Amino acid sequence: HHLEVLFQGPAELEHLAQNISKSHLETCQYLREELQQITWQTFLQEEIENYQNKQREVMWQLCAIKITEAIQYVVEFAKRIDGFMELCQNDQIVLLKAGSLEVVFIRMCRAFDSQNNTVYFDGKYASPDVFKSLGCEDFISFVFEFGKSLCSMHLTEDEIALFSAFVLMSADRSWLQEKVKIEKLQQKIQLALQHVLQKNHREDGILTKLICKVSTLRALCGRHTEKLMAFKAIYPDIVRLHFPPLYKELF
């Protein structure tokens, strides 16, 4: 008892970090180690050309299908975050519409080869050239830059998990009813994140460089929405008849 009281503080941070870590491990589509062992499996030049030969609307549908799969896994992660399921359906929805893509881009770092500038996509590792038919060179370059920048921090699986839970439970998304409860939850997650960050590299204070990325993610997800609305103005029926329903609902 007396010993239990002396540990209660940090024990609680460790407990929450382990909870979130586990939720992350069990809701990622692929194992980190799996992804790292096949970075050499890049598309061959012939396959690259084929993707480049596809029509704009065709490449967009494919990417939306692939992104929707990753989002499905992020929704499973959210469900397991303590507090998320206690919120009103309305706040649950607002946090997912705003954060599900941000968590995807965070998870992208586990499936990104920084030295060669390539991302795991449709079975192989893809250079930015694979996405040329989208007609979004700037948005694509921003995505890869983000991948490179998060990789350069060599975040551990537990670090990625707590950072995912952090930008997901943000109390500043517009239209939230329970700002105070969500805020108290993010604060805990953040103390837990700092706890695990210092466990590995009290060498710096990267928590700030990480929290700095938060603003970059919002701009990245903001551009996605802009590009998508621009695409939907030209291909309204492609979006309506061939885009995945969950992607439509979210974006």
Q: By C-beta, is 210 or 220 nearer to ligand C3S? A: 220
Decide: is 67 part of the binding site for ligand C3S (CB under 6 A): yes
Could you tell me the smallest distance in angstroms from the CB atom of residue 175 to ligand C3S? 24
Only segment of 24-32, 38-46, 149-157, 215-223 that touches ligand C3S (CB under 6 A): 24-32
Supply the DSSP string of the chain, one letter for each residue.
-HHHHHHHHHHHHHHHHHHHHHHHHHH-SS-HHHHHHTTT-BPPHHHHHHHHHS-HHHHHHHHHHHHHHHHHHHHHHHHTSTTTTTS-HHHHHHHHHHHHHHHHHHHGGGGEETTTTEEEETTEEE-GGGGGGGS-HHHHHHHHHHHHHHHTT---HHHHHHHHHHHHS-TTSTT-S-HHHHHHHHHHHHHHHHHHHHHHHTTS-THHHHHHHHHHHHHHHHHHHHHHHHHHHH-HHHHHHHS-HHHHHH-
Decide: is 182 part of the binding site for ligand C3S (CB under 6 A): no
Total number of residues that touch ligand C3S (CB under 6 A): 21
Query: Binders of ligand C3S among 89-148, rule CB under 6 A?
Result: 104, 107-108, 110-111, 119-121, 131, 143
Decide: is 73 part of the binding site for ligand C3S (CB under 6 A): yes
Q: By C-beta, is 43 or 131 nearer to ligand C3S? A: 131
Could you tell me the smallest distance in angstroms from the CB atom of residue 77 to ligand C3S? 9
- Interface contacts to ligand C3S, rule CB under 6 A: 28-30, 63-64, 66-67, 70, 73, 104, 107-108, 110-111, 119-121, 131, 143, 224, 227
